[PDB]
DNA sequence: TAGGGTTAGGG
């Protein structure tokens, strides 16, 4: 049994009329659901327009994710790896991005190093090992862009990532402005 | 479109 957090998906953009039942009836087509709930206002019962579905295994999570686009109750919804409550506190933790910030990589890190670890998560479109402007000095971090945002989500939910023989920190990339706005 | 009475004691 893998962790509950890794077996759960956030389902955004739910129709006003989606219920635990209708939601379950839809996502169960890809596996056994161990939890399925629609979040609604605790005071007015009004649906908050999002919910969660949890499968018995992450493989079933991947199957469902490979079944995108998902249309539930006539509304195109948006399934997403569930970000823990703790990580949801982080800036931009819920953004739909294709690029990840990879920090703490050795100076001699080369593109193949990044590929031997990240390709497993999805198609890589761009790899950028950052260096200093005019200096040429390696700055110790890189950006990797994938063709699917879920490849990023699958990555950022994991705690450790080994590149060029050592652990590195991987986060969703924030723009120059988002960074400055979260600072 | 980010969580369901789900987050720092008392020795």
Swiss-Prot record:
Summary of the function given for this chain in its UniProt record: Involved in the packaging of pre-mRNA into hnRNP particles, transport of poly(A) mRNA from the nucleus to the cytoplasm and modulation of splice site selection. Plays a role in the splicing of pyruvate kinase PKM by binding repressively to sequences flanking PKM exon 9, inhibiting exon 9 inclusion and resulting in exon 10 inclusion and production of the PKM M2 isoform. Binds to the IRES and thereby inhibits the translation of the apoptosis protease activating factor APAF1. May bind to specific miRNA hairpins.
Chain residue numbers at which the record places covalent cross-link Glycyl lysine isopeptide (Lys-Gly) (interchain with G-Cter in SUMO2): 1, 71, 172, 176
Region of interest: Globular A domain: 1-87
Placement of covalent cross-link Glycyl lysine isopeptide (Lys-Gly) (interchain with G-Cter in SUMO): 106
Subunit structure comment from the entry: Identified in the spliceosome C complex. Identified in a IGF2BP1-dependent mRNP granule complex containing untranslated mRNAs. Interacts with SEPT6. Interacts with C9orf72. Interacts with KHDRBS1. Interacts with UBQLN2. Interacts with PPIA/CYPA. Interacts (via the RGG-box) with the HOXB-AS3 peptide; the interaction inhibits binding of HNRNPA1 to the intronic sequences flanking exon 9 of the PKM gene, preventing inclusion of exon 9 and promoting inclusion of exon 10 which suppresses formation of the PKM M2 isoform and promotes production of the M1 isoform. (Microbial infection) Interacts with HCV NS5B and with the 5'-UTR and 3'-UTR of HCV RNA.
Residues in RRM domain copies: 7-90, 98-177
Record protein name field: Heterogeneous nuclear ribonucleoprotein A1
Portion of the full sequence shown: 8 to 190 of 372
Source taxon at top rank: Eukaryota
Originating species: Homo sapiens
Parts forming coiled coils: none
Disease implicated: Inclusion body myopathy with early-onset Paget disease with or without frontotemporal dementia 3: An autosomal dominant disease characterized by disabling muscle weakness clinically resembling to limb girdle muscular dystrophy, osteolytic bone lesions consistent with Paget disease, and premature frontotemporal dementia. Clinical features show incomplete penetrance. Amyotrophic lateral sclerosis 20: A neurodegenerative disorder affecting upper motor neurons in the brain and lower motor neurons in the brain stem and spinal cord, resulting in fatal paralysis. Sensory abnormalities are absent. The pathologic hallmarks of the disease include pallor of the corticospinal tract due to loss of motor neurons, presence of ubiquitin-positive inclusions within surviving motor neurons, and deposition of pathologic aggregates. The etiology of amyotrophic lateral sclerosis is likely to be multifactorial, involving both genetic and environmental factors.
Span list, region Globular B domain: 88-178
Gene: HNRNPA1
UniProt subcellular location: Nucleus; Cytoplasm
Modified positions (Phosphoserine) in chain numbering: 15
PTM note: Sumoylated.
